[PDB]
């Protein structure tokens, strides 16, 4: 239930998230090929609302993966606990012709994250951790905030940015 | 000295650590070099002589398997032709479930024939063509080949008759015991429609005593322990639900306020009433086990433990509907005393130990039930998961068997059949395809010869006996195994058969994959990050 | 020079050496893509970083995905993406004529000239080629069989001739089943999905529709024989108010009459359409379908499969238009003005499954304006190549239609192009009647190109047909198969008019732009 | 050899000499607890890396506190674990058995 998807966005922003997705599955009892270790009830009650629990018990988090290069998401994949990612969640020359650089990407991001809100049940919101100086976070992130809103414009949208003389009469 | 500068237009505008191949010799010979070395690879896991294999993924985790699907998994490929290769396999390993190792051979064998093709002067395209010639025509004379078609899938002994052979090519000497167990669970779940659900078949393992000890069970099992104090029931009237065992709340945020004395002094007592009403009305129906997906609380448990109530607390999501099938229930989203079509029924529902693990047994007296669960007791977590893999197989036979009727001899004799045949075909076509197709005949004996070598005799003289008895109209002798001396036998009566829609998909693909690496001209690699 | 003493660090190529690099870059580029025009050409396999694997023949794909770094490469590039995106066809030709221009302006230009004449030649050239081929070109009446020879000259030089026999019937069929009589063809009617099995030459059409999504409650019937259909975009979760609010309850009585009492807002929603389904289908003998673009609970999912009602949640936005044009009913916001006038109609609904995929079939439509494309294959690559080919023939059919008129191929025009101006070129004054033999020079490339490929001699063949087309005055074009001329609209090989115009003037534009740069410089910032 | 089949790091090994080695190794394993068996066998210490110390005469145990990370010894681990778990005694003869 309030089930919450995450959007990683730039290499910074990709590492963060990378980080923080290894330090929730610590906690958890989620290891890094999928299965449960963990002793404690308290730790599988609200296990649902970050991630799939796919037939055959192993577990998928409720992640996108998104950088306008072919490195960034190869070197998460190399790096631990980069395995556990479902393989058709990535995103991936920076300007061509089109009248509009992006609008490819950004499509296909929106088809990803549909379906992804399409398993969940009653999804609440986005957590969006990206770069707010870089150009990917203002320029290439063409107003990706903006394209959540007015796909799902009554949903929370929670984005964590990286930070005299003349003194007379009157 | 002095230096090669380097060549003017696209050797100057490649990027740095780029690669760009062309041509025969710096591609086609490279790729053709890299599959054979791949089918190299695996070619020694092939037949009832095959050898297990011990590997160890980059997470330190142990395999000990001789399933080529599993192998090729747990290894990790580098280059382009072999990832084209290993996901033909993967393909037929999806499509089928078996027949992944004879796809790698045929590919290998049909690279390493077109090689020397290409070596004396023919271009790819003929290669392509006749590739594809001889291919049609197997596939055409394939059906004329077919024996001995499956009669009953509902007793017990044909099943397991059936089914003996795909276990035995991994298991050699447990194979009796495993297709009856298999045969046993697969008859007990099969509806009178044609449809079987593989998913329907669970897998228990359990550490303890020999293979030998396992065993077959109409019902389910899990490795859990009763929440409450109840243990046992001998006739369960089950009742299933989804949310948690206790009071709900509001899913806006709230907040109990008081403005007196008498409602501090009144919360808790009526708070406490309400559960004991609730937990009695669903009492009073006849439950005797209550099964939750989610948390339950103190005072619901005393109330349960009260009123004489068996608490079962299972959570997967997919074991409760598991259960739900198995039981005859439906899931309750919100805590209400179930009616009657919501009830279901077990008889036995108890709390056991085996082997140093606590398990909770939902059990019936159903031969047929909706599913059933195998219960494997291995000394080692390795040999459990070999057993299960084989078990697997068993089942996708079982599967496929329903989905066609059709049988056809194996160890060799489909295969010399199918390669005399395109010989006599290919002897009677002009042109500069007829070596093509000639190749594509040849390539067929790679199987007899791998199971001789497997076997650990001279394969030369096999092919030579089974050229020559074939050629008398003897269409259902094959290889022996059990003799020393190189030798032949009549596969039809030994009961040596395997699945015909199998041997059409692997033909397919194998070809399939072969003319896509042969098409390839020219690769251009990225630096690796 | 005088930049360096500004900018010590800077980078500058003056008169001569931008000509060479420019002229360099050009004919590397080419060197390279001129193996892929004709049927007969290779097949390219490209290695990403990441390990994945993609063969491809098209040359926009090839340009975007070979490694290279070159401002020249990228003009050249921008160029064929923008090709691309407005016609669909004609990627390679592009490079390969500009390649040819700058090469044959280069080789006057090295015995002195200037690149002015060239330029003027070359505007002339360009006018005079264009007025041929609007006189060249054959206007017919566009029936099934003009469109059937048009898409199949386009798709079979991308796949074998058993697939693209498949693949033309289908893509042929849909643009003739989602057109009428006026308004203009509009894609994103037709929906390309694509199933990973049962190898490609089950590609097939269907008069209907296909979801990537089925139902998610258990009980649902897996099956509908006649179907009315529900599209809507209302939402039937739980919803909180926008201004901040909360209960404030004094006793477990008054928590669950707060409990109960906050669902009535969607109970009622799920109430109207019970009430609507009753109404409709009395007895048990139809079925109905909801289709949502928004989500559904739990709850509601349960309280509409009691009375066999099939839901389906998350629709994507497109297929809210897809829908109302396949089955024909009105996507509606709200329930206030619930009739039957707002339902659709369809003859089949099932769902399929794939391991861990889920898939819808809308089935048996009236009279469908949209269709769907159902590609299939055992491979990834296979899915994207036959997916990259099924836009392109698409493109060149829907383009058949828009123009009135088709154009003989296989580098007839050419010839007669070629032809043409070396008659013309004695008119003009000056010296740009050698701008215009280079012109025609560079136009020479196609079928020299097409030769090559088959295995020919360039020379010999050229010479032929060219020896045919003066004697006769027959469009006459190349065998691939035996070298001999031959004559392209009685075997069947045509193109679109407007990829040659387009093609003719892009080349031409970006062939005088780049001639006359005077120097390359990089001064600005690192 | 320009591209190589598999990643560069893996070590393969076939044939005799491997099982050979397999046999070696299992003797060096039933050797670790070859002394603690019969009622004049003596017992073992083993000292971890936080410097906790463990004294026994337990096969299972002392098997389980060795760090064992051969493939072909580990299996000789797991058959004491089952032993173990399953009837409680006779841990170290079945590794001397084997
Ligand atoms: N008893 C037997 N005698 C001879 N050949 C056998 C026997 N059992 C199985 N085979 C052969 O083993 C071959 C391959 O089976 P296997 O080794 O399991 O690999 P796969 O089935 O994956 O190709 C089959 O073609 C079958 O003919
Ligand atoms: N069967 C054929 N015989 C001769 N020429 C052909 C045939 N099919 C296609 N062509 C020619 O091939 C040329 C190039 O098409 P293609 O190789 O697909 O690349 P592009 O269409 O991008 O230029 C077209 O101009 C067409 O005239
Ligand atoms: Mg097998
Ligand atoms: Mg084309
Ligand atoms: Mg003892």
């Given at each position: 239930?309030?089930?919450?998807?995450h959007?990683?966005?730039?290499?910074?922003?990709?590492?963060?998230?990378?980080?923080?997705?290894?330090?929730?599955?610590?906690?958890?009892?989620?290891?890094?090929?999928?299965?449960?270790?963990?002793?404690?009830?308290?730790?599988?009650?609200?296990?649902?609302?970050?991630?799939?629990?796919?037939?055959?018990?192993?577990?998928?988090?409720?992640?996108?993966?998104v950088?306008?290069?072919?490195?960034?998401?190869?070197?998460?994949?190399?790096?631990?606990?980069?395995?556990?990612?479902?393989?058709?969640?990535?995103?991936?020359?920076?300007?061509?012709?089109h009248?509009?650089?992006?609008?490819?990407?950004?499509?296909?991001?929106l088809?990803?994250?549909?379906?992804?809100?399409?398993?969940?049940?009653?999804?609440?919101?986005?957590?969006?951790?990206?770069?707010?100086?870089?150009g990917?976070?203002?320029?290439?992130?063409?107003?990706?905030?903006?394209?959540?809103?007015?796909?799902?414009?009554?949903?929370?949208?929670?984005?964590?940015?990286?930070?005299?003389?003349?003194?007379?009469?009157? | 000295?002095?230096?090669?500068?380097?060549?003017?237009?696209?050797?100057?505008?490649?990027?740095?650590?780029?690669?760009?191949?062309?041509?025969?010799?710096?591609?086609?010979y490279?790729?053709?070099?890299?599959?054979?070395?791949?089918?190299?690879?695996?070619?020694?896991?092939?037949?009832?002589?095959?050898?297990?294999?011990?590997?160890?993924?980059?997470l330190?985790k142990?395999?000990?398997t001789?399933?080529?699907?599993?192998?090729?998994?747990?290894?990790?490929?580098?280059?382009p032709?072999?990832?084209?290769?290993?996901?033909?396999?993967?393909?037929?390993?999806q499509?089928?479930?078996?027949?992944?190792?004879?796809?790698?051979?045929?590919?290998?064998?049909?690279?390493?024939?077109?090689?020397?093709?290409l070596?004396?002067?023919?271009?790819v395209?003929?290669v392509?063509?006749?590739?594809?010639?001889?291919?049609?025509?197997?596939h055409?004379?394939l059906?004329?080949?077919?024996?001995?078609?499956?009669?009953?899938?509902?007793?017990?002994?044909?099943?397991?008759?059936?089914?003996?052979?795909?276990?035995?090519?991994?298991?050699?000497?447990?194979?009796?015991?495993?297709?009856?167990?298999?045969?046993?669970?697969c008859?007990?779940?099969?509806?009178?429609?044609?449809?079987?659900n593989?998913?329907?078949?669970?897998?228990?393992?359990?550490?303890?005593?020999?293979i030998?000890?396992?065993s077959?069970?109409?019902?389910?099992?899990?490795?859990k322990?009763?929440?409450?104090?109840?243990?046992?029931?001998?006739?369960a009237?089950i009742?299933?639900?989804?949310?948690?065992?206790?009071?709900?709340?509001?899913?806006?945020?709230?907040?109990?306020?008081?403005?007196?004395?008498?409602?501090?002094?009144?919360?808790?007592?009526?708070?406490?009433?309400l559960?004991?009403?609730?937990?009695?009305?669903?009492?009073?129906?006849?439950?005797?086990?209550?099964?939750?997906?989610?948390?339950?609380?103190?005072?619901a448990?005393?109330?349960?433990?009260?009123?004489?109530?068996?608490?079962?607390?299972?959570?997967?999501?997919?074991?409760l509907?598991?259960?739900?099938?198995?039981?005859?229930?439906?899931?309750?989203?919100?805590?209400?005393?179930?009616?009657?079509?919501?009830?279901?029924?077990?008889?036995?529902?108890?709390?056991?130990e085996?082997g140093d693990?606590?398990?909770?047994?939902?059990?019936?007296?159903?031969?047929?039930?909706?599913?059933?669960?195998?219960?494997?007791?291995?000394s080692?977590?390795?040999?459990?998961?070999?057993?299960?893999?084989?078990?697997?197989?068993?089942?996708?036979?079982?599967?496929?068997?329903?989905?066609?009727?059709?049988l056809?001899?194996?160890?060799?004799?489909?295969?010399?059949?199918?390669?005399?045949?395109?010989?006599?075909?290919?002897?009677?076509?002009?042109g500069?395809?007829?070596?093509?197709?000639?190749?594509?005949?040849?390539?067929?004996?790679?199987?007899?010869?791998?199971?001789?070598?497997?076997?650990?005799?001279?394969?030369?003289?096999?092919?030579?006996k089974?050229?020559?008895?074939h050629?008398?109209?003897?269409?259902?002798?094959?290889?022996?195994?059990?003799?020393?001396?190189?030798?032949?036998?009549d596969?039809?009566?030994?009961?040596?058969?395997?699945?015909?829609?199998?041997?059409?998909?692997?033909?397919?693909?194998?070809?399939?994959?072969?003319?896509?690496?042969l098409?390839?001209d020219?690769?251009?690699?990225?630096?690796?990050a | 020079?005088?930049?360096?003493?500004?900018?010590?660090?800077?980078?500058?190529?003056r008169?001569?050496?931008?000509?060479?690099?420019?002229?360099?870059?050009?004919?590397?580029?080419?060197?390279?893509?001129?193996?892929?025009?004709?049927?007969?050409?290779t097949?390219?396999?490209?290695v990403?970083?990441?390990?994945?694997?993609?063969?491809?023949?098209?040359?926009?794909?090839?340009?975007?995905?070979?490694?290279?770094?070159?401002?020249?490469?990228?003009?050249?590039?921008?160029?064929?993406?923008?090709?691309?995106?407005?016609?669909?066809?004609?990627?390679?030709?592009?490079?390969?004529?500009?390649?040819?221009?700058?090469?044959?302006?280069?080789?006057?230009?090295?015995?002195?000239?200037?690149?002015?004449?060239?330029?003027?030649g070359?505007?002339?050239?360009?006018?005079?080629?264009?007025?041929?081929?609007?006189?060249?070109?054959?206007?017919?009446?566009?029936?099934?069989?003009?469109?059937?020879?048009?898409?199949?000259?386009?798709?079979?030089?991308?796949?074998?001739?058993?697939?693209?026999?498949?693949?033309?019937?289908?893509?042929?069929?849909?643009?003739?089943?989602?057109?009428?009589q006026?308004?203009?063809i509009?894609?994103?009617?037709?929906?390309?999905?694509?199933?990973?099995?049962?190898?490609?030459?089950?590609?097939?059409?269907?008069?209907?529709?296909?979801?990537?999504?089925?139902?998610?409650?258990?009980?649902?019937?897996k099956?509908?024989?006649?179907?009315?259909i529900?599209?809507?975009?209302?939402?039937?979760e739980?919803?909180?108010?926008?201004?901040?609010?909360?209960?404030?309850?004094?006793?477990?009585?008054?928590?669950?009459?707060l409990?109960?009492?906050?669902?009535?807002?969607?109970?009622?929603?799920?109430?109207?359409?019970?009430?609507?389904?009753?109404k409709?289908?009395?007895?048990?003998?139809?079925?109905?379908?909801?289709?949502?673009?928004?989500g559904?609970?739990?709850?509601?999912?349960?309280?509409?499969?009691?009375?066999?009602?099939?839901?389906?949640?998350?629709?994507?936005?497109?297929?809210?238009?897809?829908?109302?044009?396949?089955?024909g009913?009105?996507?509606?916001?709200?329930?206030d003005?619930?009739?039957?006038?707002?339902?659709?109609?369809?003859?089949?609904?099932?769902?399929?499954?794939?391991?861990?995929?889920?898939?819808?079939?809308?089935?048996?439509?009236?009279?469908?304006?949209?269709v769907?494309?159902?590609?299939?294959?055992?491979?990834?690559?296979?899915?994207?190549?036959?997916?990259?080919?099924?836009?392109d023939?698409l493109?060149?059919?829907?383009?058949?239609?828009?123009?009135?008129?088709?154009?003989?191929?296989?580098?007839?025009?050419?010839?007669?192009?070629?032809?043409?101006?070396?008659?013309?070129?004695?008119?003009?004054?000056?010296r740009?009647?050698?701008?215009?033999?280079?012109?025609?020079?560079?136009?020479?490339?196609?079928?020299?190109?097409?030769?090559?490929?088959?295995?020919?001699?360039?020379?010999?063949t050229?010479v032929?047909?060219?020896?045919?087309?003066?004697?006769s005055?027959?469009?006459?074009?190349?065998?691939?198969?035996?070298?001999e001329?031959?004559?392209?609209?009685?075997?069947?090989?045509?193109?679109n008019?407007?990829?040659?115009?387009?093609?003719?003037?892009?080349?031409?534009?970006?062939?005088?732009?780049?001639?006359?740069?005077?120097?390359?410089?990089?001064?600005?910032?690192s | 050899?320009?591209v190589?089949?598999?990643?560069?790091?893996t070590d393969?090994?076939?044939?005799?000499?491997?099982?050979?080695?397999?046999?070696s190794?299992?003797q060096?394993?039933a050797?670790?607890?070859?002394?603690?068996?019969?009622?004049?066998?003596?017992?073992?210490?083993?000292?971890?890396?936080?410097?906790?110390?463990?004294?026994?005469?337990?096969?299972?145990?002392?098997?389980?506190?060795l760090?064992?990370?051969?493939?072909?010894?580990?299996?000789?681990?797991?058959?004491?674990?089952?032993?173990?778990?399953?009837?409680?005694?006779?841990?170290?003869?079945?590794?001397?058995?084997?």
């Amino acid at each position: 239930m309030r089930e919450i998807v995450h959007i990683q966005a730039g290499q910074c922003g990709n590492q963060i998230g990378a980080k923080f997705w290894e330090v929730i599955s610590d906690e958890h009892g989620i290891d890094p090929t999928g299965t449960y270790h963990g002793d404690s009830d308290l730790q599988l009650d609200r296990i649902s609302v970050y991630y799939n629990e796919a037939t055959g018990g192993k577990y998928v988090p409720r992640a996108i993966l998104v950088d306008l290069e072919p490195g960034t998401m190869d070197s998460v994949r190399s790096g631990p606990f980069g395995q556990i990612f479902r393989p058709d969640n990535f995103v991936f020359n920076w300007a061509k012709g089109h009248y509009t650089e992006g609008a490819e990407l950004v499509d296909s991001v929106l088809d990803v994250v549909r379906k992804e809100a399409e398993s969940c049940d009653c999804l609440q919101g986005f957590q969006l951790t990206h770069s707010l100086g870089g150009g990917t976070g203002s320029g290439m992130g063409t107003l990706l905030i903006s394209k959540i809103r007015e796909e799902y414009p009554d949903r929370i949208m929670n984005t964590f940015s990286v930070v005299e003389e003349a003194e007379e009469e009157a | 000295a002095l230096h090669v500068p380097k060549a003017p237009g696209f050797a100057q505008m490649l990027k740095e650590g780029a690669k760009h191949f062309s041509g025969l010799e710096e591609a086609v010979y490279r790729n053709i070099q890299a599959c054979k070395e791949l089918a190299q690879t695996t070619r020694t896991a092939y037949g009832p002589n095959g050898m297990n294999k011990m590997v160890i993924n980059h997470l330190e985790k142990l395999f000990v398997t001789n399933d080529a699907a599993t192998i090729l998994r747990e290894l990790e490929v580098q280059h382009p032709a072999a990832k084209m290769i290993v996901m033909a396999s993967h393909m037929q390993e999806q499509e089928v479930g078996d027949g992944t190792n004879f796809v790698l051979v045929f590919a290998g064998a049909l690279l390493e024939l077109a090689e020397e093709l290409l070596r004396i002067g023919l271009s790819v395209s003929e290669v392509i063509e006749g590739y594809e010639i001889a291919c049609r025509k197997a596939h055409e004379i394939l059906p004329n080949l077919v024996c001995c078609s499956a009669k009953n899938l509902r007793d017990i002994d044909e099943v397991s008759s059936l089914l003996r052979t795909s276990i035995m090519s991994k298991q050699y000497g447990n194979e009796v015991f495993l297709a009856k167990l298999i045969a046993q669970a697969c008859v007990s779940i099969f509806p009178d429609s044609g449809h079987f659900n593989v998913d329907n078949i669970r897998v228990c393992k359990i550490l303890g005593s020999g293979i030998s000890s396992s065993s077959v069970l109409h019902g389910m099992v899990f490795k859990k322990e009763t929440e409450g104090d109840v243990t046992s029931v001998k006739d369960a009237k089950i009742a299933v639900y989804s949310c948690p065992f206790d009071g709900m709340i509001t899913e806006t945020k709230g907040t109990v306020l008081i403005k007196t004395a008498e409602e501090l002094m009144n919360f808790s007592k009526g708070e406490e009433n309400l559960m004991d009403a609730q937990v009695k009305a669903i009492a009073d129906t006849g439950a005797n086990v209550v099964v939750t997906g989610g948390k339950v609380a103190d005072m619901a448990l005393h109330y349960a433990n009260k009123y004489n109530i068996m608490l079962v607390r299972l959570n997967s999501k997919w074991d409760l509907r598991r259960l739900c099938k198995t039981v005859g229930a439906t899931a309750l989203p919100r805590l209400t005393p179930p009616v009657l079509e919501e009830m279901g029924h077990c008889d036995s529902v108890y709390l056991s130990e085996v082997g140093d693990t606590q398990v909770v047994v939902f059990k019936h007296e159903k031969e047929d039930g909706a599913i059933s669960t195998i219960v494997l007791r291995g000394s080692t977590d390795n040999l459990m998961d070999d057993i299960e893999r084989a078990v697997d197989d068993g089942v996708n036979t079982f599967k496929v068997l329903t989905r066609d009727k059709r049988l056809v001899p194996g160890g060799g004799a489909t295969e010399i059949e199918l390669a005399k045949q395109i010989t006599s075909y290919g002897e009677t076509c002009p042109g500069l395809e007829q070596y093509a197709i000639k190749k594509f005949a040849e390539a067929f004996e790679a199987i007899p010869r791998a199971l001789a070598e497997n076997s650990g005799v001279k394969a030369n003289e096999v092919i030579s006996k089974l050229y020559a008895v074939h050629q008398e109209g003897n269409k259902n002798v094959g290889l022996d195994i059990e003799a020393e001396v190189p030798a032949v036998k009549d596969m039809l009566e030994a009961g040596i058969l395997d699945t015909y829609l199998g041997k059409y998909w692997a033909i397919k693909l194998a070809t399939n994959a072969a003319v896509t690496v042969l098409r390839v001209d020219q690769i251009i690699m990225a630096k690796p990050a | 020079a005088a930049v360096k003493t500004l900018n010590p660090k800077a980078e500058v190529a003056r008169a001569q050496a931008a000509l060479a690099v420019n002229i360099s870059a050009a004919r590397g580029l080419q060197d390279v893509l001129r193996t892929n025009l004709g049927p007969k050409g290779t097949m390219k396999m490209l290695v990403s970083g990441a390990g994945d694997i993609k063969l491809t023949k098209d040359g926009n794909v090839l340009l975007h995905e070979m490694q290279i770094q070159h401002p020249t490469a990228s003009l050249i590039a921008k160029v064929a993406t923008a090709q691309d995106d407005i016609t669909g066809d004609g990627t390679t030709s592009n490079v390969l004529i500009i390649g040819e221009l700058l090469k044959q302006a280069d080789l006057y230009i090295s015995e002195g000239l200037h690149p002015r004449i060239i330029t003027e030649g070359f505007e002339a050239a360009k006018e005079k080629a264009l007025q041929f081929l609007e006189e060249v070109k054959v206007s017919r009446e566009m029936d099934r069989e003009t469109l059937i020879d048009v898409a199949r000259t386009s798709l079979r030089t991308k796949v074998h001739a058993e697939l693209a026999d498949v693949l033309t019937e289908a893509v042929v069929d849909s643009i003739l089943a989602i057109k009428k009589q006026d308004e203009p063809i509009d894609l994103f009617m037709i929906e390309i999905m694509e199933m990973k099995h049962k190898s490609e030459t089950d590609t097939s059409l269907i008069r209907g529709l296909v979801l990537d999504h089925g139902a998610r409650h258990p009980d649902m019937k897996k099956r509908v024989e006649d179907a009315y259909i529900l599209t809507c975009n209302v939402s039937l979760e739980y919803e909180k108010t926008e201004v901040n609010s909360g209960f404030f309850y004094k006793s477990a009585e008054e928590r669950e009459k707060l409990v109960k009492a906050e669902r009535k807002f969607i109970e009622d929603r799920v109430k109207k359409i019970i009430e609507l389904k009753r109404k409709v289908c009395g007895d048990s003998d139809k079925g109905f379908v909801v289709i949502n673009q928004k989500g559904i609970d739990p709850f509601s999912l349960d309280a509409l499969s009691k009375e066999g009602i099939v839901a389906l949640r998350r629709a994507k936005r497109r297929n809210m238009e897809r829908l109302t044009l396949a089955c024909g009913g009105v996507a509606l916001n709200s329930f206030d003005d619930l009739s039957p006038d707002c339902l659709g109609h369809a003859g089949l609904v099932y769902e399929y499954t794939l391991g861990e995929e889920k898939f819808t079939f809308i089935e048996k439509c009236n009279n469908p304006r949209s269709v769907t494309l159902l590609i299939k294959g055992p491979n990834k690559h296979t899915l994207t190549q036959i997916k990259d080919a099924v836009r392109d023939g698409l493109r060149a059919v829907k383009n058949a239609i828009d123009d009135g008129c088709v154009v003989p191929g296989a580098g007839a025009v050419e010839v007669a192009m070629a032809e043409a101006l070396i008659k013309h070129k004695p008119s003009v004054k000056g010296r740009a009647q050698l701008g215009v033999q280079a012109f025609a020079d560079a136009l020479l490339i196609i079928p020299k190109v097409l030769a090559q490929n088959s295995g020919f001699d360039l020379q010999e063949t050229l010479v032929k047909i060219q020896a045919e087309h003066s004697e006769s005055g027959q469009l006459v074009g190349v065998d691939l198969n035996t070298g001999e001329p031959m004559v392209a609209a009685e075997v069947g090989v045509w193109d679109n008019y407007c990829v040659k115009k387009q093609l003719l003037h892009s080349c031409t534009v970006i062939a005088t732009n780049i001639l006359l740069v005077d120097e390359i410089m990089r001064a600005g910032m690192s | 050899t320009p591209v190589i089949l598999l990643k560069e790091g893996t070590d393969s090994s076939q044939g005799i000499p491997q099982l050979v080695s397999n046999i070696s190794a299992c003797q060096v394993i039933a050797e670790a607890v070859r002394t603690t068996l019969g009622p004049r066998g003596m017992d073992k210490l083993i000292v971890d890396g936080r410097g906790k110390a463990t004294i026994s005469n337990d096969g299972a145990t002392i098997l389980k506190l060795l760090d064992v990370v051969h493939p072909a010894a580990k299996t000789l681990v797991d058959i004491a674990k089952s032993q173990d778990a399953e009837v409680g005694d006779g841990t170290t003869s079945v590794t001397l058995l084997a």
